[PDB]
Symmetry: D2
Subunit: 383 residues, 4 copies
Amino acid sequence: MQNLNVGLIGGGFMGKAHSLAYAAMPMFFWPAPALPVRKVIAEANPELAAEAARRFGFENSTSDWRSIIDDPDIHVVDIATPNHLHAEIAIAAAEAGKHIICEKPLARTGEESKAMYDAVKDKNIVHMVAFNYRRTPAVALAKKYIEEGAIGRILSFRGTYLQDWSADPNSPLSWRFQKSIAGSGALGDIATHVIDMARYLVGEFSAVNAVLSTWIPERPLQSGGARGGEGPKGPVDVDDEVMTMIRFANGAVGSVEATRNAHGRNNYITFEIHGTEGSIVFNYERRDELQVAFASDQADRRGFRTVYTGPAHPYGEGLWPIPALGIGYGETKIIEAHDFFKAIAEGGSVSPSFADGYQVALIDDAIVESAAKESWVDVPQIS
Amino acid sequence: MQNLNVGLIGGGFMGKAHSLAYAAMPMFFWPAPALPVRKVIAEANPELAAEAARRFGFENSTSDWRSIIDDPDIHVVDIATPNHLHAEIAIAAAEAGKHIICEKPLARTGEESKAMYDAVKDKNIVHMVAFNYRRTPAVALAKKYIEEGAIGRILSFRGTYLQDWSADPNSPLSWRFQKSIAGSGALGDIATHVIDMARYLVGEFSAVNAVLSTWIPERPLQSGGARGGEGPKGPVDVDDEVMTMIRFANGAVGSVEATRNAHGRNNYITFEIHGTEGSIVFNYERRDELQVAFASDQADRRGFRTVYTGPAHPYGEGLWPIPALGIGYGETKIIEAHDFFKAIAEGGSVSPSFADGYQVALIDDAIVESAAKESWVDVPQIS
Amino acid sequence: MQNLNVGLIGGGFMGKAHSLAYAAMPMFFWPAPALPVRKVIAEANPELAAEAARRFGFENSTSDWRSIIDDPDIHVVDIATPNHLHAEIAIAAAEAGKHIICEKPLARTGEESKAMYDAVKDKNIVHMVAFNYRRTPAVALAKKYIEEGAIGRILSFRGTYLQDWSADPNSPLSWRFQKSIAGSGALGDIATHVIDMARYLVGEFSAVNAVLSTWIPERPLQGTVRGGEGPKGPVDVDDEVMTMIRFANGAVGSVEATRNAHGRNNYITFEIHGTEGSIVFNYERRDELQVAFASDQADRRGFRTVYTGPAHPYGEGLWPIPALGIGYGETKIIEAHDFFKAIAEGGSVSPSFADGYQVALIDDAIVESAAKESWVDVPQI
Amino acid sequence: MQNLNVGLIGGGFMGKAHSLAYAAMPMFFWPAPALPVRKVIAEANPELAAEAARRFGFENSTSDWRSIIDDPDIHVVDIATPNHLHAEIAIAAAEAGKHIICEKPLARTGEESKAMYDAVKDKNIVHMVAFNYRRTPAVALAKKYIEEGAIGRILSFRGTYLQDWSADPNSPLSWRFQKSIAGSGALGDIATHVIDMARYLVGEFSAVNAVLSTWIPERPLQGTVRGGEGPKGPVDVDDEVMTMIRFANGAVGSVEATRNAHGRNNYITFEIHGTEGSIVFNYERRDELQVAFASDQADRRGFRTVYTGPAHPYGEGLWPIPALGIGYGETKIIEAHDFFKAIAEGGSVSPSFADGYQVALIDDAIVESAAKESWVDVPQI
């Protein structure tokens, strides 16, 4: 069992979720495909980097991410920066022969995402984009039901990602509100999670037809850096909200809606799927649960079942002794890391890859063009 | 307090809901605006009509609906036939000076709906279309919150009507699956209920962009009239499912989805409204409840409240002593009849009227054209 | 079909729920067992009674309920008065050979209830006590699943009725807080509805062990006056009851009811654990029954939410699809259907005065238990 | 910050929940009170122990737990064994001046628990019992609302822990069904978690009145063999407990726990009724707390579903928005945070062995009550 040395670049507060995954994955899944080692962490300056290494349990620290890419003893690069730095870092890591996990969206733009995909697609490396929510056991359970034929053929998909964290106009202008850094707003940040689920559970997209909305068009800068610390107001040039209708390649239909401006909605990732022989509903705010209705039930006892994920369900062998002992965000990252390291050790590939990341970027570009032209747009299809 | 003689035309099994409303409305709301009298019922033949009069407690019966229209002692005509007969009947009743409540959709087509509206709009009569679900107390409560400014300005609306009663392909080809009688399928039958709610709670529609789907394109005729009694198969030439994006006149955005093919969904009428200062969610399968989230709550105790309707809420004075004593379908019809008879007695008008019925028909025509042309279509606006 | 003339006594504005049931029952259940006629209604004075007759649609009105009992053309007496008048009216109605539906609790104590049971048990009349909530279709569905063996043998029952309508100390003193009139408080008014569901779904009670609590000991009044000085008068009943239960069939359980649970409106629940499944019900969401079958496939097991409609009990008489919506009125319609059916067919109906009396014996045992802080056996009629 | 060396004893594969907490606690809560070090782990034999050390990331392994107690470089002992070994290990750990976190129940009986309490109560060490579920952020939030006066004075408490993992008669005999090893069944294993929440949120118990039930009296085995013939052996503990409760502060309530509720997985609930509001919690949906405030405006009153995050207790150490998702591991991380905080600051932590012992006195009183069919006073330590 090989030690694989991880370099984490950035990650913000949420670096805890990355370093949790690397520390806990072999505890959960044993024998492990390989032993992750928290070898080096990069942050914006050496003091921050040193402190993060202390907090997150990394052996070494640096303010120079290139030093990680050029260290022949780093096996894995974890890219957890904002969207504008993914491509440079990933392409450099791909050329140095490193396995890569990258945060979503894959990049700021479709063209930038293509360059990342092109850099990895022919190398002998494992590449993964962090659509971690598809590894919620309930979501993998939905996939299991679908693949088995348990709900028949899929006709219709509804997926949402509703949030309220920026719904106060005094919430400051950060990079997530700046097209030049993020590329898009709700679309890239939260709709991509839902789009990944649609691709996973339903299939590829054929065409989209969308509307983008910006509800809080100006926000205060933070004068003291990234109430009473306001600087000047600046404009928000990204979407707060996206809705899109979808025609799937396989003839199903659907729709995706995401917003940052839904008071009472925290991390409300949902889908509802209607098949010819049943339906499946999911709500990440209650992520331990999957709801499923089978048409085959006797007429006097039909309806949605609330199924709690546990040992009987996908990834159960790595998780808790009983259903509802409690899945949080961390378990999705632990499962993600397990599958990532399994691909590395077995010389194979993982889903979702940079291929998937790039297909989502192509869907995003189509949504933006559709919204601008007020018309259906076809989505080019990589696979 | 005047006796007002009602003639009910048709109604199917659901005539019980009409005759319940006329019998119970003064019991609930007293003194009543007027005393409904179940004077005469029309059905397809004299025997059926006589039996329905016995079952529903009507004094007289007829197989000739014109005899009701020409009886100068009938004050109110209740039109509960299928969509294809609304216009003839209503226009004849309007010309005879009778007050009219008509089932939805108002007619089979937009043009037919205009003729009904034109026939009544200048008369001194009360005209009402039976979008009864907007008189669910929870829905009137949502309106109260919105009108007060309690959730700020509306940004976004989501409304659905999901059902499964025809999701088995062996369910027979009835008039509801025939464009020549019904005009449309899910659109006219169930999306119109949701569209009425969108107009009530949000405002008028500016434009739509839609997709119509037919999932069960053939059904068996019933050989023994309207398993083992099948006749020949015939085609379904209407939609099983509609989704549409919406631009509202007031600048809000939204979407409406309705289907007959969602296993596990029975009478799942929902809406979710996002305002600048709160959100409102409703589910008719749990109609006693309204969910509302206020942005103004202190940060450590924010979220959706589940509010049970009772004496403190709209129409409470006519209903039960406490919240959750239980609202069913009948109370919506009782409230509807109260407001209808109040307009009659006070020489005024009621909402929704044939104006509202016709505006919905115009929205429906726009959805169908949008779906065919795959493009945005503007909705002409009556008011 | 035969016309059966109903005389309604009392009820306040909720007389409308009775009137609705008699007017609508044949509309819903057709062909109907018989035709209810709203013949006569009694209220406190001639004028109020005539006004109620107009509102509720009765042909005649009276301020003397004995005139209804003595009227040979009245077939059915509906007693909707408070607890202190049920016995006298019911006994006179029985002696005059009327069919009787009586509000719950059947009377204030088991002794007073026994007198009503004795007056009807050997007569050729139909008698029913208005535990209407057992005729919520979801509760009849629970009964169907249990009797078919679908959740196995019942091990355990939890039943609650939680309300908040008097949770405010300023909610005024009414008869419902006065032992001399009501007999008991939460116990009699709302625990009895749950106790009825427990007898219906699980079976007879063998013993109880209970705690009664009064949280608000006085309330504004609106010789109770000569008591007594100042704005308020004493509450001498329970605001809350909880009791543990041994069932005759060896199941265990518990019932809790309260008037002092902020956020709970009409929260009538039960949860039953069987050897092969479980059932959960919440009247605030009365269209639903929740059921978990141990036989489900292991990766797709849990409680399913079943909406009642045509396929479930009473469905043929109700709405054409599930979740069109059951309210309070439909429970009264179903109650009336079964009442008039029993009358038409010369049968009996459950729950009868026998059930009403059995429930009053359970309440007595609860009160005795709470005072002695001891288990009390429940006499089985 | 100081390195504190942990020796973990036992735990089975759920050792991972301990290892996760020690590795992740500083990642979450920063700056951290101290740095946990996974120093040594003990399992049944040298080889299994070395394998566990590799899996869970401990530096050393042993099959003799006394070697950890006697190692002067070990600061913290974590006891994750079954109930029969907690006392001996804890007492030796105390005598050697180690800080101790022990699995619940603290021991098999109140007498055995008293010995552990006595061994630690006057030493300068931090001792904690692993009622981890009280550190679900929603439960700490409940505590916040209660202590601020937001639901008034508590009147009533209902608490449940319903499970189904042994609802099948074929689920095998394990130590958890053997009185000699476990001490009790559902009572000790899961009612204690609820009892801890009741002491935390409401206050001390004054008296209990209880029923214990065994539904499945024998199970397959996988001198218990020389017992004994054939595939199965006897269960001599409770599968289910229910108890009524009088609180020292005059509130009332009840606790019910079972292993035989099909559809219930890890269903840890409570419902508290206060004079000015109510709180409802369900661990199967542990991100939520439901709260109804009587002060809400009358047309917009009901239970609100509050999702925990940065604004609620422990939020600064957890996820950046509500509903990013709390699981079991985060409760263990929060537990560890407070444990190591108390160590770093020379303080104490709740729940301690004092709380563990008080809970064992309540269980004794429940068992006595059930046998006598009587109310039993609970000794207050």
